Design a protein around this ligand. Structure first.
Ligand SMILES: Nc1nc2c(ncn2[C@@H]2O[C@H](COP(=O)(O)OP(=O)(O)O)[C@@H](O)[C@H]2O)c(=O)[nH]1
Ligand SMILES: [Mg+2]
Length: 381
């Protein structure tokens, strides 16, 4: 059809990455600018995830495109082949990504990826915001708390508690007005004497730019209880549809378009392909052990990305000004000219600022020099 959803990982029995696959799309000339949205939905299998998404399209394909008319046996996460570009004026230039968790679910421990990798997380919850649901949000409030000391800047931007089939609008009215009555409660109250480490209601704010909750009307017994739905639009309750119209926009079009911001700085799309394979290593270990750091893995991709960011620059400053149509023959101070570009590759490397440590970071520029300086010791003399 018009577009497909590409797998990124599998599971049974290992936990492969489809490196090419992810790469075979992000690298399209949406190589940029600003990965960003990066909107994801996750949570309870068949609490209607891959459906809220399916309206994210049949209602986005038409504010970015035609402005009027017109995981079967594997987990991992989805990406739609289509991607939604923008913008100007003071932008950006922004690609738009949709991920839809799925597959081996029986929240099935692949909500961290789909959150580590996301500028807008939609925790797709049912009935109520329970405590168990609140307990899956631990391994970030610590991971980030470190980072809070470390980077100094809150990782994670927006988490959207989405309550599907909320059923007492008389206490709290459907939508954002009541999303933030219910939420505010359940992060007061049982912060008072009741649970132990889930008392991370105290740390949450710090680790997210925006945390907000939304309450959905039950759609209807006919959608809820039917195998392979289509019917018609009437077949859905008006209360649902009226909510979408407040929902989907609320999230989409800028500035509800949320900038993916590692360290404290936006990121292009060509760098996701890094962050994707980086985390994914220390997930089920790549060997055995987890988690909390995490901060090892984020920094180590926070960093190796600037290397490849300031190595592309090297060539694309050297073999043009210092080579190519006037090639590889002595001057004898192309060296002097190469020092310049090497310097540029370091003087303009320290873009300010990534993160990871001190002896941990500069470890890399040690290997920029020794990987930059390996053209001075070249090529065929
Ligand atoms: N109760 C309820 N059911 C829904 C809602 N939205 C979709 N469904 C039903 O959920 C099923 C599909 O869920 P789906 O998104 O594919 O599974 P998931 O991706 O794993 O969450 C179908 O029966 C839909 O009728 C909702 O808001 N409430
Ligand atoms: Mg699904």
């Amino acid at each position: 059809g018009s577009a497909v959803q590409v797998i990124n990982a599998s599971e049974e029995h290992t936990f492969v990455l489809n490196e090419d696959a992810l790469s075979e799309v992000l690298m399209r000339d949406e190589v940029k600018d600003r990965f960003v949205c990066v909107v994801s939905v996750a949570g309870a299998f068949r609490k209607g995830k891959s459906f809220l998404l399916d309206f994210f399209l049949r209602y986005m394909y038409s504010k970015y495109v035609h402005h009027d008319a017109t995981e079967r046996d594997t987990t991992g996460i989805l990406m739609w082949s289509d991607i939604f570009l923008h913008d100007y004026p003071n932008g950006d230039k922004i690609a738009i990504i949709l991920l839809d968790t799925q597959g081996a679910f029986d929240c099935a421990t692949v909500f961290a990826l789909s959150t580590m990798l996301s500028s807008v997380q939609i925790y797709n919850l049912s009935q109520n915001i329970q405590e168990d649901d609140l307990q899956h949000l631990q391994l970030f409030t610590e991971y980030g708390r470190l980072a809070l000391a470390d980077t100094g800047k809150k990782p994670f931007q927006r988490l959207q508690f989405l309550v599907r089939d909320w059923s007492f609008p008389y206490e709290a009215e459907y939508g954002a007005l009541g999303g933030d009555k219910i939420l505010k409660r359940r992060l007061e109250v049982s912060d008072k004497q009741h649970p132990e480490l889930q008392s991370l209601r105290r740390h949450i704010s710090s680790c997210f730019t925006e945390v907000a909750c939304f309450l959905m009307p039950h759609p209807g017994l006919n959608v809820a209880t039917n195998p392979k739905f289509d019917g018609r639009l009437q077949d859905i309750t008006p209360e649902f549809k009226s909510s979408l119209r407040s929902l989907v926009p609320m999230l989409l079009a800028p500035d509800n378009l949320v900038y993916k911001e590692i360290s404290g700085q936006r990121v292009r799309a060509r760098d996701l392909i890094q962050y994707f394979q980086s985390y994914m290593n220390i997930y089920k270990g790549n060997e055995l052990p987890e988690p909390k750091s995490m901060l090892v893995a984020t920094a180590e991709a926070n960093h190796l990305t600037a290397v490849a960011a300031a190595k592309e620059l090297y060539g694309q400053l050297m073999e043009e000004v210092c080579g190519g149509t006037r090639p590889y023959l002595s001057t004898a101070h192309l060296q002097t000219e190469h020092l310049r570009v090497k310097d540029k590759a370091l003087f303009q490397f320290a873009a300010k600022r990534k993160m990871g440590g001190e002896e941990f970071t500069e470890k890399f520029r040690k290997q920029l020099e020794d990987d930059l300086e390996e053209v001075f010791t070249n090529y065929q003399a």
